Design a protein around this motif. Structure first.
Motif, PDB file in Angstrom:
ATOM      1  N   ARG A   1       0.811  -1.338  -0.029  1.00  6.18           N
ATOM      2  CA  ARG A   1       0.004  -0.101   0.086  1.00  6.18           C
ATOM      3  C   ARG A   1       0.965   1.130  -0.138  1.00  6.18           C
ATOM      4  O   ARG A   1       1.817   1.179   0.755  1.00  6.18           O
ATOM      5  CB  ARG A   1      -0.990  -0.109   1.125  1.00  6.18           C
ATOM      6  CG  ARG A   1      -2.042  -1.013   1.072  1.00  6.18           C
ATOM      7  CD  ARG A   1      -3.379  -0.856   2.043  1.00  6.18           C
ATOM      8  NE  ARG A   1      -4.298  -2.240   1.930  1.00  6.18           N
ATOM      9  CZ  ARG A   1      -3.999  -3.073   2.672  1.00  6.18           C
ATOM     10  NH1 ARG A   1      -2.963  -3.162   3.479  1.00  6.18           N
ATOM     11  NH2 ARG A   1      -4.996  -4.349   2.619  1.00  6.18           N
ATOM     12  N   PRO A   2       0.518   2.190  -0.708  1.00  5.82           N
ATOM     13  CA  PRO A   2       1.443   3.444  -0.882  1.00  5.82           C
ATOM     14  C   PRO A   2       1.289   4.198   0.610  1.00  5.82           C
ATOM     15  O   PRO A   2       0.289   4.252   1.271  1.00  5.82           O
ATOM     16  CB  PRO A   2       0.852   4.392  -1.915  1.00  5.82           C
ATOM     17  CG  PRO A   2      -0.137   3.371  -2.693  1.00  5.82           C
ATOM     18  CD  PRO A   2      -0.479   2.358  -1.860  1.00  5.82           C
ATOM     19  N   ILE A   3       2.464   4.753   1.000  1.00  3.23           N
ATOM     20  CA  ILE A   3       2.289   5.488   2.515  1.00  3.23           C
ATOM     21  C   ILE A   3       3.404   6.750   2.220  1.00  3.23           C
ATOM     22  O   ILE A   3       3.947   6.886   1.262  1.00  3.23           O
ATOM     23  CB  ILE A   3       2.929   4.648   3.682  1.00  3.23           C
ATOM     24  CG1 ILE A   3       4.544   4.236   3.283  1.00  3.23           C
ATOM     25  CG2 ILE A   3       2.182   3.660   3.786  1.00  3.23           C
ATOM     26  CD1 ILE A   3       5.235   3.756   4.289  1.00  3.23           C
ATOM     27  N   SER A   4       2.957   7.790   3.057  1.00  2.00           N
ATOM     28  CA  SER A   4       4.015   8.806   3.229  1.00  2.00           C
ATOM     29  C   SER A   4       4.445   8.978   4.771  1.00  2.00           C
ATOM     30  O   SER A   4       4.693  10.095   5.319  1.00  2.00           O
ATOM     31  CB  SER A   4       3.247  10.242   2.619  1.00  2.00           C
ATOM     32  OG  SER A   4       2.088  10.295   3.452  1.00  2.00           O
TER      33      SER A   4
ATOM     34  N   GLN B   1      -0.861   8.593  13.221  1.00  2.00           N
ATOM     35  CA  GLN B   1      -2.550   8.205  12.510  1.00  2.00           C
ATOM     36  C   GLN B   1      -2.530   6.645  12.911  1.00  2.00           C
ATOM     37  O   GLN B   1      -1.564   5.771  12.715  1.00  2.00           O
ATOM     38  CB  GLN B   1      -2.804   8.331  11.125  1.00  2.00           C
ATOM     39  CG  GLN B   1      -2.709  10.220  10.809  1.00  2.00           C
ATOM     40  CD  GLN B   1      -2.589  10.298   9.300  1.00  2.00           C
ATOM     41  OE1 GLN B   1      -2.588   9.488   8.752  1.00  2.00           O
ATOM     42  NE2 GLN B   1      -2.769  11.533   9.088  1.00  2.00           N
TER      43      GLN B   1
ATOM     44  N   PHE C   1      -4.737   3.462  11.518  1.00  3.81           N
ATOM     45  CA  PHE C   1      -6.031   2.788  10.791  1.00  3.81           C
ATOM     46  C   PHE C   1      -6.417   1.444  10.995  1.00  3.81           C
ATOM     47  O   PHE C   1      -5.470   0.419  11.639  1.00  3.81           O
ATOM     48  CB  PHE C   1      -5.256   3.096   9.435  1.00  3.81           C
ATOM     49  CG  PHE C   1      -5.098   4.409   8.719  1.00  3.81           C
ATOM     50  CD1 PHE C   1      -3.927   4.928   9.229  1.00  3.81           C
ATOM     51  CD2 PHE C   1      -6.033   5.198   8.090  1.00  3.81           C
ATOM     52  CE1 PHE C   1      -3.889   6.383   8.924  1.00  3.81           C
ATOM     53  CE2 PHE C   1      -5.793   6.244   7.693  1.00  3.81           C
ATOM     54  CZ  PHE C   1      -4.782   6.894   7.970  1.00  3.81           C
TER      55      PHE C   1
ATOM     56  N   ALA D   1      -4.388  17.329   7.727  1.00  3.77           N
ATOM     57  CA  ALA D   1      -3.562  16.489   7.559  1.00  3.77           C
ATOM     58  C   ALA D   1      -4.073  15.188   6.864  1.00  3.77           C
ATOM     59  O   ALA D   1      -4.749  14.598   7.386  1.00  3.77           O
ATOM     60  CB  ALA D   1      -2.781  15.979   8.986  1.00  3.77           C
ATOM     61  N   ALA D   2      -3.216  14.957   5.714  1.00  2.38           N
ATOM     62  CA  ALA D   2      -3.649  13.609   4.695  1.00  2.38           C
ATOM     63  C   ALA D   2      -3.432  12.542   5.307  1.00  2.38           C
ATOM     64  O   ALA D   2      -2.449  12.395   6.182  1.00  2.38           O
ATOM     65  CB  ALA D   2      -2.961  14.063   3.197  1.00  2.38           C
ATOM     66  N   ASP D   3      -4.077  11.506   5.143  1.00  2.00           N
ATOM     67  CA  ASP D   3      -3.971  10.054   5.401  1.00  2.00           C
ATOM     68  C   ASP D   3      -2.374   9.762   5.081  1.00  2.00           C
ATOM     69  O   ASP D   3      -2.040  10.021   3.932  1.00  2.00           O
ATOM     70  CB  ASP D   3      -5.022   9.404   4.590  1.00  2.00           C
ATOM     71  CG  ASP D   3      -6.441   9.348   5.371  1.00  2.00           C
ATOM     72  OD1 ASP D   3      -6.325  10.145   6.395  1.00  2.00           O
ATOM     73  OD2 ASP D   3      -7.104   8.470   4.724  1.00  2.00           O
ATOM     74  N   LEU D   4      -1.742   8.914   5.827  1.00  2.00           N
ATOM     75  CA  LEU D   4      -0.262   8.223   5.666  1.00  2.00           C
ATOM     76  C   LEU D   4      -0.430   7.233   4.813  1.00  2.00           C
ATOM     77  O   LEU D   4       0.493   6.536   4.605  1.00  2.00           O
ATOM     78  CB  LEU D   4       0.648   8.305   7.041  1.00  2.00           C
ATOM     79  CG  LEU D   4       0.619   9.622   7.790  1.00  2.00           C
ATOM     80  CD1 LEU D   4       1.004   9.530   8.942  1.00  2.00           C
ATOM     81  CD2 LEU D   4       1.211  10.710   6.901  1.00  2.00           C
ATOM     82  N   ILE D   5      -1.556   6.629   4.604  1.00  3.64           N
ATOM     83  CA  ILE D   5      -1.633   5.390   3.915  1.00  3.64           C
ATOM     84  C   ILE D   5      -2.940   5.481   2.713  1.00  3.64           C
ATOM     85  O   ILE D   5      -3.946   6.160   3.435  1.00  3.64           O
ATOM     86  CB  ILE D   5      -1.689   4.036   4.717  1.00  3.64           C
ATOM     87  CG1 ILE D   5      -1.742   2.859   3.987  1.00  3.64           C
ATOM     88  CG2 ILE D   5      -3.060   4.354   5.838  1.00  3.64           C
ATOM     89  CD1 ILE D   5      -1.660   1.635   4.912  1.00  3.64           C
ATOM     90  N   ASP D   6      -2.766   5.017   1.801  1.00  2.00           N
ATOM     91  CA  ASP D   6      -3.470   4.959   0.643  1.00  2.00           C
ATOM     92  C   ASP D   6      -4.486   3.680   0.254  1.00  2.00           C
ATOM     93  O   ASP D   6      -3.396   2.528   0.231  1.00  2.00           O
ATOM     94  CB  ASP D   6      -3.032   5.653  -0.576  1.00  2.00           C
ATOM     95  CG  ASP D   6      -3.927   5.675  -1.784  1.00  2.00           C
ATOM     96  OD1 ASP D   6      -5.102   5.616  -1.564  1.00  2.00           O
ATOM     97  OD2 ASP D   6      -3.577   5.696  -3.073  1.00  2.00           O
ATOM     98  N   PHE D   7      -5.640   3.467   0.468  1.00  2.00           N
ATOM     99  CA  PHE D   7      -6.357   2.354   0.380  1.00  2.00           C
ATOM    100  C   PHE D   7      -6.968   1.994  -0.817  1.00  2.00           C
ATOM    101  O   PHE D   7      -7.451   1.125  -1.296  1.00  2.00           O
ATOM    102  CB  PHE D   7      -7.273   2.073   1.458  1.00  2.00           C
ATOM    103  CG  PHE D   7      -6.798   2.239   3.193  1.00  2.00           C
ATOM    104  CD1 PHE D   7      -6.053   0.951   3.558  1.00  2.00           C
ATOM    105  CD2 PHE D   7      -7.036   3.179   4.043  1.00  2.00           C
ATOM    106  CE1 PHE D   7      -5.542   0.910   4.865  1.00  2.00           C
ATOM    107  CE2 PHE D   7      -6.464   2.876   5.306  1.00  2.00           C
ATOM    108  CZ  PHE D   7      -5.839   1.856   5.365  1.00  2.00           C
TER     109      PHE D   7
ATOM    110  N   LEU E   1       0.891   4.727  12.179  1.00  2.00           N
ATOM    111  CA  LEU E   1       1.780   5.549  11.266  1.00  2.00           C
ATOM    112  C   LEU E   1       2.045   6.797  11.657  1.00  2.00           C
ATOM    113  O   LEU E   1       1.324   7.367  12.281  1.00  2.00           O
ATOM    114  CB  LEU E   1       0.926   5.541   9.808  1.00  2.00           C
ATOM    115  CG  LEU E   1       0.535   4.321   9.273  1.00  2.00           C
ATOM    116  CD1 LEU E   1      -0.186   4.516   8.141  1.00  2.00           C
ATOM    117  CD2 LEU E   1       1.820   3.383   8.892  1.00  2.00           C
TER     118      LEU E   1
END
Lengths: 361, 8
Positions: free
Chosen positions: A62-65, A87, A89, B1-7, A80
């Protein structure tokens, strides 16, 4: 030819297309035996790879930042962070459960329970409960003896009344461990020289209540020592647990070696100690008696967790081998009687942990 | 603040 422990290879992460450059302390986390998370840049895009240990051949990318990812011990719930931004999830729900912005960068964090995340900043330690709308709560201020250490671990007793932060640094050209033990009830910190530690619950025969034990291993100037100490005033009615100190042997060719991980089996009341440079040791929790020592590898195992199935220890080395060590329940009593010639210990352990082979001594 | 993961 009989050994008191069993090795098992569970996985090679390179067989799942994990790049060996991402198999290290800062990029691969294993907070429990249920999941491994690996941060990889694959092209321009930072991803997290999540290995479900029950379905290892089907990892999810999964992409992350995030600069860090730690999976909850029990649930597909991931913590994260990026700097001060935290955060949480629920991955199956694709939902942000909690968020908090710290006022300090979090330099180390980990799950200390099914429901609590510990945060270490440059100057303090926090607990963040996942219950309701809880935000991080400061537990204590870091002691000056850990200033400028690499923080490598944080542990607590079951009731989160005894807290232990562990840092290392280069001093006089060896790796020196600096621990801070904090009493939540007494609000006092004790600096201790130490490399690896664990807490444990142990009920002495003739005690109604469990004792809370603090176990740590150190390579000091004195050399290798392991300590087993009751922390807190014994529950009333309880006999106190007498403190144990024993040597931790390093061979002459391992002059630069030191302890890096400890897990305690409460099923077997044994202490597993792993050294930086690939040695495994097994100690009796009750007496501290060294049961067994051996080389696994030349390879550093850089992360470990309890192995729930075997009441053992699981880890990952820099090659990406996922390896567990547990008590061999069939051999341990014969091994202690015959190879160690310690029928006294053999017999104690046989009845204490309901094991076979002390019928004949 | 944007999500640090993309689902997605």
């Amino acid at each position: 030819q009989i050994l008191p422990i069993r090795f098992q290879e569970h996985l090679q992460l390179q067989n799942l297309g994990i790049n060996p450059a991402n198999i290290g302390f800062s990029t691969l986390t294993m907070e429990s035996d249920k999941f491994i998370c690996i941060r990889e840049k694959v092209g321009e895009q930072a991803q997290v790879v999540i290995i479900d240990m029950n379905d290892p051949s089907n990892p999810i990318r999964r992409p992350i930042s995030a600069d860090s990812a730690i999976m909850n011990p029990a649930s597909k719930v991931i913590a994260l962070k990026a700097g001060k931004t935290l955060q949480i999830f629920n991955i199956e729900m694709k939902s942000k459960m909690k968020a908090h912005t710290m006022t300090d960068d979090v330099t180390f964090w980990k799950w200390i329970s099914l429901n609590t995340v510990a945060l270490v900043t440059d100057n303090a330690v926090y607990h963040w409960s996942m219950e309701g709308e809880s935000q991080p709560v400061k537990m204590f201020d870091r002691h000056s003896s850990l200033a400028g250490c690499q923080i490598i671990n944080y542990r607590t007793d079951a009731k989160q009344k005894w807290l232990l932060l562990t840092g290392i640094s280069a001093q006089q050209n060896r790796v020196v461990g600096a621990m801070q033990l904090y009493s939540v009830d007494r609000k006092v910190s004790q600096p201790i020289e130490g490399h690896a530690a664990s807490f444990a619950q142990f009920k002495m025969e003739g005690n109604a209540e469990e004792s809370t034990l603090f176990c740590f291993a150190v390579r000091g100037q004195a050399g290798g020592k392991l300590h087993i100490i009751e922390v807190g005033t014994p529950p009333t009615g309880n006999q106190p647990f007498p403190k144990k100190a024993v040597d931790v042997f390093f061979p002459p060719e391992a002059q630069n070696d030191f302890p890096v991980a400890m897990q305690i089996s409460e099923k077997h009341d044994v202490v597993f100690l792993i050294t930086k440079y690939g040695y495994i040791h097994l100690y009796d929790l009750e007496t501290g008696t060294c049961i067994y020592m051996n080389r696994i590898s030349g390879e550093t195992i850089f992360v470990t967790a309890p192995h729930e199935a075997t009441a053992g220890i699981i880890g990952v080395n820099r090659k990406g081998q996922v390896l567990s060590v547990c008590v061999e329940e069939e051999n341990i009593i014969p091994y202690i009687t015959n190879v160690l010639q310690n029928p006294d210990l053999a017999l104690r352990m046989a009845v204490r942990n309901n094991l076979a082979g002390a019928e004949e001594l | 603040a944007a999500d640090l993961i993309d689902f997605s």
